[PDB]
Design a protein around this ligand. Sequence first.
Ligand SMILES: CN1CC[C@H](c2c(O)cc(O)c3c(=O)cc(-c4ccccc4Cl)oc23)[C@@H](O)C1
Lengths: 294, 261
Amino acid sequence: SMENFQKVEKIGEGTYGVVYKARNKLTGEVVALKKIRLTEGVPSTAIREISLLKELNHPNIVKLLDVIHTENKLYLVFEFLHQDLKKFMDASALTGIPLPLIKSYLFQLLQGLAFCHSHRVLHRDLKPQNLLINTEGAIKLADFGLARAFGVPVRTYTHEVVTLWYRAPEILLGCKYYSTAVDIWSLGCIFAEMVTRRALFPGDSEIDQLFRIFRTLGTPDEVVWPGVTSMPDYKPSFPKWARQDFSKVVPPLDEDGRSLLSQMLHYDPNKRISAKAALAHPFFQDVTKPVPHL
Amino acid sequence: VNEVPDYHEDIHTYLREMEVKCKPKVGYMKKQPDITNSMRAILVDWLVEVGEEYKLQNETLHLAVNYIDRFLSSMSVLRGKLQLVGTAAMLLASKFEEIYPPEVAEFVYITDDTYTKKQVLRMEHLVLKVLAFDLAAPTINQFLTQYFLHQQPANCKVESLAMFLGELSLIDADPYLKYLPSVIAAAAFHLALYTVTGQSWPESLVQKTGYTLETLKPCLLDLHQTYLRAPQHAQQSIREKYKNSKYHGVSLLNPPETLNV
Ligand SMILES: CN1CC[C@H](c2c(O)cc(O)c3c(=O)cc(-c4ccccc4Cl)oc23)[C@@H](O)C1
């Protein structure tokens, strides 16, 4: 089963299990082996991750090659990607990421995310540790451990969902329903983070996180967001901060960039831009596919 | 955005393609030496009680029945094990679909200790191997909820009646295994719309689906009968369930005598 594979290096670990870099002895292909943690049978995170990744086949989504199910181990075999966007941003702390590469990566992330949403899948955990890059200029969505298949229209799903810093306001405010818009919020926070090299809303509790969002975009009312003051966790005592101009939120960013960023971060999920629509934004008029500069 | 305007058409096209790949063998029951359409009906009725008892989503029940029919399309099973297959399918569907699935121990309790926890867990593993982890199947519900967005205006009794008719179709392999989920759902929607309001399968749903009253006619005839005889059926757990006010007491409405079709 694992007889064809030679382990090369342990490259990550967490609640999920552990990942190794490995080599197929007969074909030469370099793979990632994600060994899943094993109570209550096969975990639901792995059932969902496997069944959805088998349906999703796209150049900006990680490719599941095989599943090895020993009855005592569970390994997912993936095509290998060398580094995550978090580690790349930290390694580019000295003078930052060039604008052509920022454009290429965001363009690719939107293709991949549009493909998920066209196939009725929400990711629900987009952030730089879960976005992987290679030596040829590609970037891909990874870690589908939190993903879920959705119906049309959606019903109520799990409330404890996105990592806090990247979590949309409709989740923070305890709405009954959420949809594809939560993944767009996260990508908007990631876009800012690639331009500046630090998180846009780094809160330390749910309430701190809301107040940080309000201090940048302004406290929402009934005019900018119909129904906001009727939501389960909306407090009338919330402070009324003024909306900041967007040139002050991300100073180095040109006019097109700012327009796209603002549509990604719109308060009302119904007005927030779709991934599919964002690919046509003028910010991408001159987009290429450069390789990473490091 | 809860109705995903920029994606519902892509999603519909995809579910249509997937329902053909996830389809059971139509003739599987004839090739099972020890089981029958009648034993399968007892099993599905039992899973409806289990779903009502643990407050499971209807989608969970539909997926479980999909996993069971695909498993039995490839594996021969003795009568004394059919319940073990069903219990593992219901556990897997719960894990896939529910926010809070019951624990493995709660699934051993409802089999009346016919089986062990070790047997339930092994069977879970065997079902995953046989279906190769393809668990994101299209169901009658995934289509029904999309069709509902075409009511003018939305009517709550139409919706719950259609759910009820679709759910009755899961019990009887003959005839319903020969119809795709999207077709059973079109039939169930028309019949519910006509029974409650007197309107018919609309034009906007002809543009979306390609289905006309003409193409839906065979399934609609089978479904009309099932509705008429439903108070006479040996299995009644679906009727008990749709008395409840959560489903607007729709199992109390009276079926129409003819369709004019
Ligand atoms: C917490 N998350 C992180 C992503 C991780 C994951 C995948 O889901 C799928 C994959 O194909 C890979 C991969 O090919 C390489 C790496 C990796 C690279 C550099 C450094 C560390 C790692 Cl782990 O991760 C992958 C995911 O399963 C776990």
